[PDB]
Amino acid sequence: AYTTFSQTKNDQLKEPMFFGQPVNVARYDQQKYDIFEKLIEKQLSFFWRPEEVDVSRDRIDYQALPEHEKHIFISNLKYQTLLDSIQGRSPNVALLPLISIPELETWVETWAFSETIHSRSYTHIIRNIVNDPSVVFDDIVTNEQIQKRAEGISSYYDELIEMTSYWHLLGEGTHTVNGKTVTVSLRELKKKLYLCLMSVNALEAIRFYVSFACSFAFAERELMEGNAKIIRLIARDEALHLTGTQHMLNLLRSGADDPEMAEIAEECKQECYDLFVQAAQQEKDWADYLFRDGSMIGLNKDILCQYVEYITNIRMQAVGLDLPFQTRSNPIPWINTWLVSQIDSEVDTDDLSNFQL
Amino acid sequence: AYTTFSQTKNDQLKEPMFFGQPVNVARYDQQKYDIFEKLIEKQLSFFWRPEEVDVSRDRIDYQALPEHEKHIFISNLKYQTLLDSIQGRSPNVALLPLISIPELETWVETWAFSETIHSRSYTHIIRNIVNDPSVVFDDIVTNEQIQKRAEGISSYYDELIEMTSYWHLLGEGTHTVNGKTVTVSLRELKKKLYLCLMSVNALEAIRFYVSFACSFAFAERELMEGNAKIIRLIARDEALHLTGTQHMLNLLRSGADDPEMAEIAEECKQECYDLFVQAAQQEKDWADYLFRDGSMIGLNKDILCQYVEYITNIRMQAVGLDLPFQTRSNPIPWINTWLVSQIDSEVDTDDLSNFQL
Amino acid sequence: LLVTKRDGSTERINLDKIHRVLDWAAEGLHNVSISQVELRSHIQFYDGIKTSDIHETIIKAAADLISRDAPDYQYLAARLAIFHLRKKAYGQFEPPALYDHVVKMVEMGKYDNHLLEDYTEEEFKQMDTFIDHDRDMTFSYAAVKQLEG
Numbered sequence: 001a002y003t004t005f006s007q008t009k010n011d012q013l014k015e016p017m018f019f020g021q022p023v024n025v026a027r028y029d030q031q032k033y034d035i036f037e038k039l040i041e042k043q044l045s046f047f048w049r050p051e052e053v054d055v056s057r058d059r060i061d062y063q064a065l066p067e068h069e070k071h072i073f074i075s076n077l078k079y080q081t082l083l084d085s086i087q088g089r090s091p092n093v094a095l096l097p098l099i100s101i102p103e104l105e106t107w108v109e110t111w112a113f114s115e116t117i118h119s120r121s122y123t124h125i126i127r128n129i130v131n132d133p134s135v136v137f138d139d140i141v142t143n144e145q146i147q148k149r150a151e152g153i154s155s156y157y158d159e160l161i162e163m164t165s166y167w168h169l170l171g172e173g174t175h176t177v178n179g180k181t182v183t184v185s186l187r188e189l190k191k192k193l194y195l196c197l198m199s200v201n202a203l204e205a206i207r208f209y210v211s212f213a214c215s216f217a218f219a220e221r222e223l224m225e226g227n228a229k230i231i232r233l234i235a236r237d238e239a240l241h242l243t244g245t246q247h248m249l250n251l252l253r254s255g256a257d258d259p260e261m262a263e264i265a266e267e268c269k270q271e272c273y274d275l276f277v278q279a280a281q282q283e284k285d286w287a288d289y290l291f292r293d294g295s296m297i298g299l300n301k302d303i304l305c306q307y308v309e310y311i312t313n314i315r316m317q318a319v320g321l322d323l324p325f326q327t328r329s330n331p332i333p334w335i336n337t338w339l340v341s342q343i344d345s346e347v348d349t350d351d352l353s354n355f356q357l
Numbered sequence: 358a359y360t361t362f363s364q365t366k367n368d369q370l371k372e373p374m375f376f377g378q379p380v381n382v383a384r385y386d387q388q389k390y391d392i393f394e395k396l397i398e399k400q401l402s403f404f405w406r407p408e409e410v411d412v413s414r415d416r417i418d419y420q421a422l423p424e425h426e427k428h429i430f431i432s433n434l435k436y437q438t439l440l441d442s443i444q445g446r447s448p449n450v451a452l453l454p455l456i457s458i459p460e461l462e463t464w465v466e467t468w469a470f471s472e473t474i475h476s477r478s479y480t481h482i483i484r485n486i487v488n489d490p491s492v493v494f495d496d497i498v499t500n501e502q503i504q505k506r507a508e509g510i511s512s513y514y515d516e517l518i519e520m521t522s523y524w525h526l527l528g529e530g531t532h533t534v535n536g537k538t539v540t541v542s543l544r545e546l547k548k549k550l551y552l553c554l555m556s557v558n559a560l561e562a563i564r565f566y567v568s569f570a571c572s573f574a575f576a577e578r579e580l581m582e583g584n585a586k587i588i589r590l591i592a593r594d595e596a597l598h599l600t601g602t603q604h605m606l607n608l609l610r611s612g613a614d615d616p617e618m619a620e621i622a623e624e625c626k627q628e629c630y631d632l633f634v635q636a637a638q639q640e641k642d643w644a645d646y647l648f649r650d651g652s653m654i655g656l657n658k659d660i661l662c663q664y665v666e667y668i669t670n671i672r673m674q675a676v677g678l679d680l681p682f683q684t685r686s687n688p689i690p691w692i693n694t695w696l697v698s699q700i701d702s703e704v705d706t707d708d709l710s711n712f713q714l
Numbered sequence: 715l716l717v718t719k720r721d722g723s724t725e726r727i728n729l730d731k732i733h734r735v736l737d738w739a740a741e742g743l744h745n746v747s748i749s750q751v752e753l754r755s756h757i758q759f760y761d762g763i764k765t766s767d768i769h770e771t772i773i774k775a776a777a778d779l780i781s782r783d784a785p786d787y788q789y790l791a792a793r794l795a796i797f798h799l800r801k802k803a804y805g806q807f808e809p810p811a812l813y814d815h816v817v818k819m820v821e822m823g824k825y826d827n828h829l830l831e832d833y834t835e836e837e838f839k840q841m842d843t844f845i846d847h848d849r850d851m852t853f854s855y856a857a858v859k860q861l862e863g
């Protein structure tokens with residue numbers, strides 16, 4: 001079963017990332033994988049609060065927008081509030097009961113904590129842009145275009161949480177639970193983790209960056225500049241988050257951590273590819289909904305969908321998957337601004353006399 | 358089962374603190390209990406990093422200490438590393454699958470995140486005073502004098518985590534799991550949460566403050582002043598943490614949040630009282646190990662045990678429990694410093710003659 | 715809000731008109747961005763804004779995006795500028811017949827009248843078959859600015 005302080009003395013440098021002995025003593029003088037120590041330090045150095053950004057002049061800009069541009073802004077803001085709502089709690093609930101090295105345990109909690117700052121900033125943005133924040137928040141759970149992806153994203157988490165509970169309560173084997181037969185396979189648990197991390201990677205490396213394009217496009221018109229400063233801080237955090245899942249996935253895929261895992265990751269390659277392709281398709285349809293009533297300067301359905309294909313190819317290659325879309329150049333290059341930050345008069349007649357004209 | 362984004366649109370202001378519908382949308386424009394919003398805002402404003410504190414003098418002071426005072430400092434430092442190792446992960450693993458209002462969910466993650474800074478500072482202190490930090494960290498798990506109370510605190514966490522998993526997988530009722538019959542009682546689950554929160558309160562309000570006395574005693578002699586600066590920042594955080602559990606306990610006990618909970622808190626009143634007294638007895642037992650090789654100016658076994666009884670009465674009364682020890686004044690009053698923040702020449706002869714001698 | 719067309723008429727603003735003209739100018743080019751041109755224009759719309767001022771603004775924006783990393787902007791800005799110069803002289807994209815143009819220009823005093831004395835209408839129509847107006851699509855932006863300037 002899961003224990004909050006395992007009694008066995010283990011060498012934490014030799015444990016795997018997941019499914020080993022639960023971490024007991026939290027030490028930060030040594031790491032098996034120093035990428036997560038660097039991610040913690042980088043995240044701690046980025047610590048920001050939403051209230052330290054001036055968002056007062058954003059209300060003027062929002063009220064002046066056309067009606068279909070209010071819809072684009074608010075739909076993108078509702079979708080962001082949803083995703084970082086899931087991300088606020090899910091890494092803690094889903095990964096902490098599985099982690100067996102301290103540096104990855106602390107990163108997941110730092111990762112999850114920084115997501116709560118993101119959720120707090122969305123309330124800060126909403127509170128300073130609309131008159132009744134309840135109108136926006138109440139629509140997030142019932143929204144037809146959002147809910148289809150909320151259940152899809154959360155299901156990978158939910159299935160991993162469920163198998164983990166069975167694995168802690170019953171252990172590996174074939175079990176009987178109220179008559180019905182239940183098989184708990186550690187190999188199947190490793191498959192639900194790998195698929196979940198893939199879904200989380202596409203969530204933070206594709207879904208959110210499509211959302212950044214909408215937020216930063218308004219800022220390129222010098223509008224919603226308070227929101228854009230906060231989204232810039234979020235995007236700086238988001239780059240760290242997707243780097244974490246990239247290293248987790250590649251370490252699992254390469255078999256460095258678990259010999260069994262390299263083979264399991266190969267059996268999932270087709271399901272992971274379909275997972276990313278479906279994620280890309282869902283965002284294209286989301287862009288189709290965003291611009292149904294019109295577009296704006298610098299962003300329309302084609303431009304945003306082209307960015308979906310551009311950003312997906314980059315992410316899928318980073319985790320060793322086949323490219324589903326055609327090679328393309330960055331359709332919105334302006335988004336990179338937001339994601340990364342006396343004459344010497346002496347003459348010698350003798351030297352000139354050496355000249356033969 | 359547990360879901361990371363419950364698809365039911367519910368009024369979060371009307372949910373209970375625990376066991377209600379899992380939190381879906383993370384919003385901070387409204388709270389059922391604003392105490393947790395104030396605690397979040399206050400914890401975020403206290404954000405500090407260990408590396409920004411000068412600890413260079415501390416290596417010299419520690420090496421110059423008598424050997425029996427080295428034992429006091431490092432044993433108290435090992436014990437602190439142990440407790441905040443549990444506190445780093447446990448509120449996240451044990452409480453997040455149960456919380457049903459967003460302000461309390463975010464506070465638990467802010468609470469847990471701040472504990473990882475504590476764990477990181479213990480590494481910062483250790484690595485700056487000893488030559489091989491591995492000797493200290495490996496001794497936390499292998500020393501028989503420390504590990505015994507790891508079992509005390511972690512057992513309340515572990516049992517709540519286990520029953521929570523049964524409650525999510527099977528639901529309430531009498532179930533048969535591999536022949537053996539298993540009963541899942543929501544009333545017994547609420548009883549394990551209340552007992553757990555009581556144990557965590559005694560951990561942060563009693564166990565850690567006994568540890569603060571040792572660190573600050575060295576500072577009153579102008580020794581280990583770099584460690585004392587860090588412990589002062591930790592103690593400021595700890596004051597927020599114990600205020601959190603106090604409000605959770607009192608809200609559950611009063612029946613304001615859940616009427617069923619008030620009845621359960623009455624059945625546990627004796628079990629909770631025994632839990633707090635035992636925690637104090639264990640800290641008395643720990644003080645016997647700290648001073649087995651001698652004492653120091655201002656602190657010995659007698660003085661520290663008096664502080665245990667002094668601080669226990671205060672904490673237990675705050676959560677509506679009977680005082681187990683005799684009333685006494687603060688035996689170390691110096692610790693409060695660290696746990697907060699011509700002639701007028703005029704004469705009137707006519708007035709004088711109206712005087713009778 | 716309304717813009718003012720080249721013929722003087724007004725109609726409410728439609729960004730698809732700007733999207734379409736940019737998609738046409740960027741067709742076949744590598745490493746160019748319709749989004750970048752619109753955003754770098756920093757176009758300040760006011761009610762009654764001339765549609766010709768809008769086009770001149772997005773020509774300057776695409777022209778200033780010429781760089782080593784995206785050299786094909788030299789053709790995007792040229793195609794936009796050629797399009798703009800067609801409207802200024804003809805009111806439309808397709809140029810008129812060579813003879814009809816020469817007659818109008820000699821009457822306005824902008825061409826030398828010897829053109830109508832040394833060449834017949836049948837000869838002017840024969841030189842119109844020599845002309846390939848698609849060769850305006852082979853200029854770079856610097857070429858067009860020297861042409862119009």
Ligand SMILES: Nc1ncnc2c1ncn2[C@H]1C[C@H](O)[C@@H](COP(=O)(O)OP(=O)(O)O)O1
Nearest residue numbers: 719720726727728731732735765768769801
């Ligand atoms: N209603 C509208 N709103 C905004 N821009 C427009 C518009 N109609 C045309 N444009 C843009 C597209 C062209 O790049 C530019 C002028 O091109 P044009 O086709 O010569 O002008 P027009 O259609 O006004 O005669 O103005």
Ligand SMILES: [Mg+2]
Nearest residue numbers: 719731735765
């Ligand atoms: Mg036109």
